[PDB]
Design a protein around this ligand. Structure first.
Ligand SMILES: CCCCCCCCCCCCCCCCCC(=O)OC[C@H](COP(=O)(O)OCCN)OC(=O)CCCCCCCCCCCCCCCCC
Ligand SMILES: CCCCCCCCCCCCCCCCCC(=O)OC[C@H](COP(=O)(O)OCCN)OC(=O)CCCCCCCCCCCCCCCCC
Ligand SMILES: CCCCCCCCCCCCO[C@@H]1O[C@H](CO)[C@@H](O[C@H]2O[C@H](CO)[C@@H](O)[C@H](O)[C@H]2O)[C@H](O)[C@H]1O
Ligand SMILES: CCCCCCCCCCCCO[C@@H]1O[C@H](CO)[C@@H](O[C@H]2O[C@H](CO)[C@@H](O)[C@H](O)[C@H]2O)[C@H](O)[C@H]1O
Ligand SMILES: CCCCCCCCCCCCO[C@@H]1O[C@H](CO)[C@@H](O[C@H]2O[C@H](CO)[C@@H](O)[C@H](O)[C@H]2O)[C@H](O)[C@H]1O
Ligand SMILES: CCCCCCCCCCCCO[C@@H]1O[C@H](CO)[C@@H](O[C@H]2O[C@H](CO)[C@@H](O)[C@H](O)[C@H]2O)[C@H](O)[C@H]1O
Ligand SMILES: CCCCCCCCCCCCO[C@@H]1O[C@H](CO)[C@@H](O[C@H]2O[C@H](CO)[C@@H](O)[C@H](O)[C@H]2O)[C@H](O)[C@H]1O
Ligand SMILES: CCCCCCCCCCCCO[C@@H]1O[C@H](CO)[C@@H](O[C@H]2O[C@H](CO)[C@@H](O)[C@H](O)[C@H]2O)[C@H](O)[C@H]1O
Lengths: 170, 155, 606, 104, 171, 459
């Protein structure tokens, strides 16, 4: 249904029923009633719907975008090149927003899954979130509402200049 | 409504004052305009600064909810003095005394909370002790480093 | 999993069905109130199933079913937290609402708009469940403001009465001031943690949480009616008694406390916020109990009781016992709802009389209401092993043995003694002695809807606290070692309150006429806070609105400095230009001046 | 202090009219003219449970099973607690018991 | 505008109600209600009006000092807990004229009788106005009092909104 | 855009060649059809805007503004046809022609590619609007309202014309797509300060900015209902749309030039909210409520953040439906009691139950009850201004309290309490009036189910 590598889940460890009471478990009978009254009728309706879908199989595709020269290769004021570089940058910006959203979803899922041990047991997810938020902030933060590839490039060059200066004097 | 029955400029002469009182359906002896600063009151009457809550609730008012009669001059701040807003009714305790007790009570409590903060109550016990170097890993400590050991002895 | 999640969602969906049918699809106004009451009772049953699964195995989950909106890196989804706090509060809230709606089928029977009343009660319930199961701050804010607006509509139920409209707007006003703190927390969390989801907030666990937590504290101050934003709660007694019962037990007022419990992973690491909440709760519990000592309106006494109990929960937050604060929410919902319904029973019997000075002699005339009122009073004051004992006594023991503000501890203990005093005040003046009500006796409490609804809450007020404490998992280490005088403090100061209250009450029967002290007037008039603040603040704000903002600036100076001055200058210039004599001699003379100036002054000839 | 004779007469005349008006508010027998045991308590509760519990839970379960839980992280459960001496259903692993306690 | 007697009697009633708010118990209130009546009785025959006004003036100051800060209010009295509670159910009678014909058809007999009341109001209006004209001084009415019907077959002038007013419990 | 411009133009022959008694039926039916086709503009792409030709383009900002504009024309026709009943035929058709011409200018204004084309249509809207106010308003004050409206606009707009012509000389183009790529930074000089002011003041007056807002309470109190609806719903948003576009070429000078206008707006919204608490004219109260709401939009546009631009877009659309609905609600009372005084007719819930429900729903959207798009817009601006400076939460939070008080004060005063005894002509709500209110509130609340379509390009 979804890629487990993209949305990982640790293997699930359920304990076996180990009762130490003679009373019947009300949940067990309710569980059986639910599977009989709710699950079985629901599954039959779905299986009928899946039969109709199997008769009419058709396909859709994930659009693929070829890479084009980015803003750094565009001559000043050459709108024809700047336009394609700008459109590509805007698409990449939307993709990076969703990459951060995937990492945040991993982090939130880990916190709920690990319960009271989440602080120790979600260190890897918190690290990856921390690193990706830093990279995303470096690319896109402070550009303003009228952002562009040109402004993003100006931001990067300022950062590279500072990093060069610090490295040289060090 | 004709222009002669609408509010006008501040009345300068006694004839104007008598005319303004008539327009507002008041006795010339009861009619008093707002002071003629440049604030824009004109000749509109200055009526007692009282809430409509203060009016007699048993009188057969034309507008019972407002306690207003048709044609009587409305207070400039009538909309502030409706029964849902500012009440000026007399109070069983003097206003000035009421402020002293409310402020005094609040000030005393705030003082005593500072005192109780400086001299907290507590029990005669030592600190709670936790194993594994005060739960260094569980509290999120870096696995790759090493905390200085926290050791707890029996007593 | 599949049964747990399905049933938890069917509970919420069941509650919306009577609202949707109001779209006339399958609509039978014959007995809409019974339809709504039946829906609540069924929802209560379905909500017990996932509650049992949590009690058994501790099962919890989060349902993020619908993706609503993505704002760049902030994905907003309809998400439901089905955990400890929601799986225990929902059945308690539904059980209490079940009784309240059954009580209302009797109490509001002659209301021409009874169908709209039950629709509003159900909407009140739905918004609170949205609040309690919300997993993100935006979904929580929906329920937060939802309950606030539903209170406005129910407090102002009798909209022809000016006092009812004033109280309704007062609740909105005080709650909107608290909402400033709520939006402050949302802004801080979005700016600093890039999230409104609880998971991410707790995972990142900021150390510098003073600003967001002060915001949450301010929101709780308004919604739970803590000192400073407190007067609106006693004013909400303008609403029909069923509104007071539901408002004070299992909806609006506990929402402020519930918000602070939901954020205990942050507050439990911030001792500064603990100190503030502790002190805010302590003054609230003491101040409002003091006000209750001298109130004569039965609903107002119970209202001030709720504020005092809410202050106690805020104290419990302050001493870092969030799960005990939650337990008190659950236990308090039973006997406090019962107390309002008992007062509704008396009020109805005495033809809308609400002054306890005009009651009395009802102990034998209303035996069942009497029994429920005594049980509820004992549960409230912490009688051992009734429902209130299983939270209040742990809270007092925890406060006594905690490292805490000493003054706040004393205020809490004294307010506990006052709880016994004002409870005695209701029993003494309402039930004992000789009747003081009018001569045409219409007392009658034999309607089965009245009896059954009170009966269910009576059973809860006896056993609910015991049953809940014995099923919830432990989440702290209770402090069970302490000196005898710290163990029994709650019972001792409560008993002395009863003894002191009885002496005060019996002294009212002596043929001596006493003059009021300043303390008596301070208590009677609620410390003058409503008298001063509700007159001074509206007056100053409303005077500025007209004198300065409207008249001085908009009607005068902003007109004067631009359009009025510009127009004046043009008019004067026009008169200068056009006021000419029409004389050939003068016009041609100005030609001579023009030509001369053109050369001598401006050298146009070069 | 007492009604003047003229006040007495006016109140008497208004009183007659008001009582005639109130008497005129009574509905006649035909108004409004409208245009054209235990077991029966099980039925209403049976049909109500079917249309307000069974049908909604059929819809929700279908919705959750075949749409919500087919997407990542839409329903996330806290993992079950595992105590010493437990057996894992997935693997058959047996968690060892805790050490032997000192006597207390 | 209130005479001296009216002021003294209003103070007596007001003081008894606040006294009853303090006492609560009926036997206790009876005891002090008699003591209070004795104080008013001790000066009942005072003749020097200057002295009597001073007594009333002082009594009002004593009442203000000793009033209950939260006196009992009858539930439907102004400031009471049921005051104005039923105003939202009071609908003016003229609203019925706007009913759809199918709504009126549900109460044929009520609306036949209503049509007779409107006929009575119409036939009587001109005589009502005329009576007020010929009984009002030239300057105008100096009080709000209204007269009764004089001739037989006449109705008291300005009766409609008193007679047809909403019921106190209209639903 | 020709698929919208041409059918809009055809509404004029339709109205003039209709049978005498079918002018309202025909114009209303076909303007609703045009509105239906406007949904085809939702074909928006994540990266590129929808660029039809050398003259017209539509992106996520102009699309919701277009759909609101085309939705309002039929609503305005329904709202107007009662108070125009006694007007003679030719003068009715002229009134409808002015409404159609306003829609024509507006859809071209919101889709013009070139800033000078935008300016001309931006300015053409004055003529039909001024005519509607001064010819079909009821009171003497409409003539003065027309003059204030006219000269406040032109005082700022003529400097804008000079600035735009200067920009085209310097840059070579005013095409907005071109300006996205050829934009250069604005350096500090007194020349650029006045270039900045000329580029922004015309839009500030239309919002209106606090201090330049005096024309607005005049224009509403005097305009007929249809004039009030388009003035509140759309014409104010010309200013917001204007700034959202022109701010592209004013950076980084906006960093500090915004300060005086943020202060006026932040303080202005509290002043104008407080004013609403003491207004005696119901139409004037609703007019002052618009000033307070648009103060947020000005702040949002000026601080230039993705969250503030999304909140500004949602706020403009949400206020359009709410404010227009409130004017329609106030007008329905006016058609019965023929006075705008708020305190004159009270307890109307007793007499008009369903209408009181529309009053409640309009009030709750006005005070931004979550999750209405009113709240979504305001909250996004609150979130972004807090990042601008944390202290703004004090002003924004206080304004939320005041907004609730006056929103519910208006509800309580007119709907609750006791009815006025002598007002006996409150006839039952007509089907036309009820349908008019539902066609405001229903789309407003339906948008809560899919807010992204009204969040603008920054989404
Ligand atoms: C942060 C920024 C804060 C901003 C606050 C805005 C305050 C707005 C001021 C109100 C403006 C007037 C609006 C009109 C409302 C009105 O006039 O109603 C009057 C109403 C009467 O109420 P009542 O006494 O019950 O009389 C009924 C019996 N006839 O009386 C009322 O209901 C109005 C009472 C409200 C008065 C304001 C009280 C503010 C209290 C703040 C101090 C506490 C600080 C926070 C708490 C401490 C935190 C731990
Ligand atoms: C912080 C967030 C706060 C939100 C506030 C806004 C309030 C809005 C009002 C609340 C709405 C509550 C109901 C939520 C579900 C309604 C939407 C829905 O179920 O269908 C959408 C769903 C698509 O799934 P999803 O990826 O999550 O959505 C992406 C596009 N938005 O489509 C599906 O997958 C379901 C399709 C299969 C349904 C089959 C069941 C049929 C049942 C019989 C008909 C009844
Ligand atoms: C368990 C409760 C713990 C908290 C208890 C808090 C109690 C603190 C009370 C502080 C308030 C005292 O406030 C004080 O009251 C007295 C009594 O009138 C006032 O006293 C003054 O006014 C009275 C009456 O006008 C006059 O006799 C005289 O002018 C003067 O005595 C003081 O001007 C005021 O400052
Ligand atoms: C901030 C940028 C925009 C500023 C625009 C300023 C230019 C002027 C705009 C309004 C011009 C309207 O033109 C004229 O104005 C004046 C007041 O201003 C109006 O006059 C009004 O005020 C004057 C003086 O208080 C009164 O004598 C008059 O009775 C009243 O109607 C005229 O009736 C109107 O014909
Ligand atoms: C930012 C630059 C904007 C430039 C815009 C230029 C707009 C010029 C508008 C017309 C100016 C003259 O407009 C004229 O103003 C004067 C006063 O203001 C008005 O005059 C009215 O108010 C004045 C002031 O109390 C009275 O003295 C006068 O008796 C009265 O008639 C005229 O009725 C109006 O016709
Ligand atoms: C060589 C170039 C010439 C180009 C001319 C193109 C258009 C020629 C149109 C000729 C027909 C005009 O029609 C004439 O005007 C109107 C509009 O129809 C008609 O009468 C009108 O009454 C009302 C409007 O008042 C409407 O119902 C409708 O518009 C029409 O019936 C006249 O009864 C008819 O005599
Ligand atoms: C929100 C609802 C709005 C209602 C609007 C009502 C007006 C509807 C206008 C319909 C216009 C259809 O216009 C016409 O549609 C047909 C489909 O049969 C398209 O037909 C074409 O579509 C695409 C084009 O890439 C290709 O599959 C192929 O070339 C062909 O099928 C035409 O490209 C288009 O010219
Ligand atoms: C609602 C009203 C809004 C009003 C807003 C007012 C904003 C005021 C902005 C002030 C900045 C103006 O722009 C500023 O002007 C100064 C001259 O004084 C310019 O100064 C320029 O000439 C001076 C010579 O004196 C040189 O020393 C300097 O090197 C050079 O920059 C700056 O280049 C520019 O930074």
């Amino acid at each position: 249904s979804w890629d487990k590598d993209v949305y990982p889940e640790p293997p699930r460890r359920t304990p076996a029923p180990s009762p130490q009471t003679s009373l019947p478990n009300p949940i067990t009978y309710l569980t059986k009633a639910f599977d009989l009254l709710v699950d079985r009728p629901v599954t039959l309706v779905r299986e009928f719907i899946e039969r109709q879908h199997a008769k009419n199989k058709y396909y859709y595709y994930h659009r693929e975008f070829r890479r084009v020269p980015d803003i750094t290769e565009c001559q000043e004021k050459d709108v024809l090149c700047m336009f394609e570089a700008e459109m590509q940058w805007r698409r990449d910006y939307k993709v990076d927003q969703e990459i951060v959203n995937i990492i945040q979803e991993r982090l939130k899922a880990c916190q709920q899954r690990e319960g009271e041990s989440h602080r120790q047991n979600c260190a890897k997810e918190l690290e990856q979130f921390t690193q990706v938020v830093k990279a995303y902030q470096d690319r896109y933060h402070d550009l303003g509402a009228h952002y562009s590839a040109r402004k993003c490039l100006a931001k990067q060059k300022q950062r590279m200049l500072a990093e060069r200066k610090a490295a040289k004097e060090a | 409504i004709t222009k002669d029955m609408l509010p006008g400029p501040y009345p300068k002469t006694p004839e104007e004052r008598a005319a303004a009182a008539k327009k507002y359906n008041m006795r010339v002896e009861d009619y008093e305009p707002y002071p003629d600063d440049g604030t824009g009151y004109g000749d509109y009457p200055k009526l007692p600064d009282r809430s409509q809550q203060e009016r007699d609730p048993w009188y057969d008012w034309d507008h019972p909810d407002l306690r207003l009669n048709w044609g009587e001059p409305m207070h400039w701040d009538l909309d502030m003095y409706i029964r849902n807003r500012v009440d000026t009714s007399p109070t069983p305790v003097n206003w000035n005394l009421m402020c002293k007790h409310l402020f005094g009570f609040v000030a005393f409590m705030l003082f005593m909370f500072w005192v109780g903060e400086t001299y907290p109550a507590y029990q005669p016990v030592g600190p709670k002790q936790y194993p594994y170097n005060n739960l260094y890993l569980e509290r999120g400590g870096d696995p790759n480093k090493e905390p200085e050991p926290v050791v707890h002895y029996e007593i | 999993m599949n049964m747990f999640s399905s049933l938890s969602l069917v509970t919420l969906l069941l509650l919306t069905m009577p609202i949707m049918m109001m779209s006339f699809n399958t609509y039978k106004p014959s007995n809409y109130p019974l339809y709504v009451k039946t829906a609540i009772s069924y929802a209560f049953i379905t909500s017990m199933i996932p509650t049992m699964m949590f009690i058994h195995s501790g099962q919890e989950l989060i349902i993020s079913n619908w993706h609503w909106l993505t704002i760049q890196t902030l994905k907003l989804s309809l998400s439901f937290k089905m955990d400890y706090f929601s799986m225990m509060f929902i059945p308690v809230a539904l059980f209490v609402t079940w009784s309240i709606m059954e009580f209302s089928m009797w109490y509001m029977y002659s209301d021409p708009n009874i169908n709209k009343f039950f629709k509003y009660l159900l909407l009140f319930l739905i918004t609170m469940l949205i609040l309690v199961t919300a997993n993100n701050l935006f979904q929580l804010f929906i329920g937060w403001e939802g309950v606030g607006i539903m209170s406005f509509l129910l407090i102002g139920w009798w909209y022809g009465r000016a006092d009812a409209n004033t109280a309704a707007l007062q609740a909105i006003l005080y709650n909107r001031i608290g909402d400033i703190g709520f939006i402050l927390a949302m802004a801080w969390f979005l700016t600093n943690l890039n999230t409104w989801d609880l998971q991410q907030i707790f995972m990142l666990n900021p150390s510098d949480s003073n600003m967001p937590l002060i915001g949450l504290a301010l929101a709780a101050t308004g919604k739970s009616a803590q000192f400073g934003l407190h007067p609106w709660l006693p004013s909400a007694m303008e609403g029909p008694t069923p509104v007071s019962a539901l408002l004070h037990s299992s909806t609006m007022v506990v929402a402020g406390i519930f918000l602070l419990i939901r954020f205990y992973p942050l507050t439990e690491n911030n001792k500064y916020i603990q100190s503030i909440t502790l002190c805010l709760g302590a003054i609230t519990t003491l101040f409002t109990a003091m006000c209750a000592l001298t109130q004569n309106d039965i609903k107002k006494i119970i209202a001030f009781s709720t504020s005092s109990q809410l202050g106690l929960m805020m104290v419990t937050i302050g001493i870092n016992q969030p799960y005990l604060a939650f337990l008190h929410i659950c236990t308090h919902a039973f006997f406090k709802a019962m107390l309002f319904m008992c007062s509704g029973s008396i009020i109805h019997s005495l033809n809308d009389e609400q002054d306890i000075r005009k009651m009395g002699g009802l102990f034998k005339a209303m035996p069942f209401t009497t029994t429920a009122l005594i049980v509820g009073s004992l549960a409230l004051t912490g009688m051992p092993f009734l429902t209130g004992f299983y939270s209040k006594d742990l809270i007092i023991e925890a406060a006594n043995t905690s490292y805490t503000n000493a003054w706040a501890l004393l205020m809490t203990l004294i307010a506990t003694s006052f709880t016994a005093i004002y409870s005695t005040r209701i029993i003494f003046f309402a039930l004992l002695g000789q009747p003081r009500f009018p001569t045409l006796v219409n007392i009658n409490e034999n309607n089965p809807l009245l009896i059954n609804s009170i009966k269910r809450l009576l059973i809860g007020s006896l056993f609910a606290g015991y049953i809940i404490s014995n099923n919830i998992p432990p989440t702290t280490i209770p402090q069970m070692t302490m000196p005898y005088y710290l163990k029994t403090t709650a019972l001792i100061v409560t008993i002395l309150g009863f003894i002191l209250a009885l002496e005060i009450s019996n002294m009212t029967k002596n043929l001596k006429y006493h003059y009021p002290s300043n303390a008596f007037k301070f208590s009677t008039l609620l410390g003058y806070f409503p008298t001063i603040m509700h007159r001074l603040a509206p007056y100053m704000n409303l005077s500025m609105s007209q004198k300065s903002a409207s008249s001085l600036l908009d009607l005068i100076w902003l007109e004067a400095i631009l359009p009025k001055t510009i127009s004046l200058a043009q008019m004067k210039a026009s008169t200068l230009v056009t006021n000419q004599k029409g004389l050939i001699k003068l016009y041609f003379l100005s030609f001579l001046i023009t030509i001369l100036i053109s050369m001598i002054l401006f050298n146009f000839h070069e | 202090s007492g009604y003047t004779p003229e006040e007495k007469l006016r109140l008497q005349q208004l009183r007659e009219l008001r009582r005639r008006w109130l008497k005129d508010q009574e509905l006649s027998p035909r108004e409004p003219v409208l245009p054209p045991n235990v077991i029966y308590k099980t039925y209403r509760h049976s049909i109500f449970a079917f249309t307000h519990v069974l049908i909604p839970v059929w819809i929700i379960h279908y919705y959750l099973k075949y749409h919500v839980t087919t997407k990542p992280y839409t329903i996330v459960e806290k993992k079950p607690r595992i105590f010493p001496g437990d057996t894992i259903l997935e693997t058959g692993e047996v968690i060892p018991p805790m050490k032997e306690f000192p006597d207390q | 505008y209130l005479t001296h007697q009216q002021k003294v009697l209003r103070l007596y009633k007001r003081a008894l109600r606040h006294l009853e708010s303090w006492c609560i118990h009926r036997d206790k209130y009876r005891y002090f209600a008699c003591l209070l009546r004795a104080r008013f009785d001790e000066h009942k025959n005072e003749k020097d009006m200057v002295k009597a006004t001073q007594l009333l003036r002082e009594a009002e100051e004593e009442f203000w000092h000793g009033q209950h800060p939260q006196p009992y209010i009858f539930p439907e009295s102004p400031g009471g807990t049921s005051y104005e509670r039923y105003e939202c159910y009071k609908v003016p009678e003229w609203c019925l004229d706007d009913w759809h014909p199918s709504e009126k058809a549900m109460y044929p007999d009520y609306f036949a009788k209503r049509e007779q009341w409107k006929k009575l109001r119409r036939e009587s209006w001109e005589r009502e106005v005329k009576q007020l004209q010929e009984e009002t001084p030239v300057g105008g009415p100096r009080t709000e009092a209204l007269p009764p019907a004089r001739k037989q077959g006449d109705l008291p002038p300005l009766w409609w909104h008193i007679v047809t007013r909403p019921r106190e419990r209209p639903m | 855009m020709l698929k919208y411009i041409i059918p809009t133009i055809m509404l004029m022959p339709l109205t003039w060649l209709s049978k005498n008694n079918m002018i309202w039926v025909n114009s209303t039916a076909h303007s609703l059809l045009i509105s239906f086709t406007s949904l085809l503009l939702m074909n928006q792409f994540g990266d590129n805007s929808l660029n039809f030709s050398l003259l017209f383009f539509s992106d996520s900002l102009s699309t919701p503004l277009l759909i609101l504009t085309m939705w309002l024309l039929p609503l305005m026709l329904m709202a107007s046809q009662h108070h125009l009943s006694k007007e003679n035929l030719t003068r009715k058709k002229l009134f409808i022609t002015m409404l159609i011409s306003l829609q024509l200018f507006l859809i071209m204004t919101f889709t013009a590619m070139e800033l000078i084309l935008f300016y001309i249509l931006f300015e053409a809207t004055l003529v039909p609007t001024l005519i509607i106010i001064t010819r079909w308003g009821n009171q003497t004050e409409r003539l003065n309202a027309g003059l204030y409206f006219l000269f406040y606009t032109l005082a700022g707009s003529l400097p804008l014309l000079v600035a735009l012509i200067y920009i085209q000389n310097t840059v070579g183009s005013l095409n907005f797509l071109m300006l996205q790529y050829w934009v250069q930074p604005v350096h500090n000089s007194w020349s650029n300060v006045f270039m900045w002011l000329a580029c922004m003041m015309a839009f500030m007056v239309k919002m209106p900015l606090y201090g330049l807002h005096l024309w607005l309470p005049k224009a509403h109190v005097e305009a007929p209902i249809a004039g009030s609806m388009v003035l509140a719903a759309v014409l104010l948003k010309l200013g917001g749309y204007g700034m959202l576009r022109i701010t592209l070429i004013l950076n980084p000078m906006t960093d500090f030039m915004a300060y005086p206008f943020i202060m006026l707006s932040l303080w202005g919204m509290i002043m104008t909210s407080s004013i609403c608490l003491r207004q005696t004219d119901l139409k004037s109260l609703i007019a002052y409520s618009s000033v307070s709401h648009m103060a947020l939009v000005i702040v949002a546009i000026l601080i230039q953040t993705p969250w503030s631009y999304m909140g500004a877009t949602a706020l403009m659309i949400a206020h359009g439906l709410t404010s227009s609905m409130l004017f329609c609600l106030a007008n329905s009372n006016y058609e019965r009691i023929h006075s705008r005084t708020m305190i004159l007719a009270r307890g109307l819930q007793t007499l008009l139950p369903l209408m009181a429900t529309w009053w409640l729903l309009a009030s709750l959207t006005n005070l931004a009850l979550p999750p209405t798009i009113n709240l979504i817009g305001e909250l996004f601006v609150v979130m972004s201004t807090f990042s601008w400076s944390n202290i703004t939460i004090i002003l924004m939070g206080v304004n939320m309290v005041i907004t609730a008080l006056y929103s519910l004060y208006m509800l309580i005063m007119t709907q609750r309490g006791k009815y006025t005894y002598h007002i006996n002509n409150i006839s039952p709500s007509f089907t036309r009036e009820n349908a008019l209110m539902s066609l405001h509130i229903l789309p407003l609340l339906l948008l809560t189910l899919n807010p992204k379509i009204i969040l603008g390009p920054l989404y």
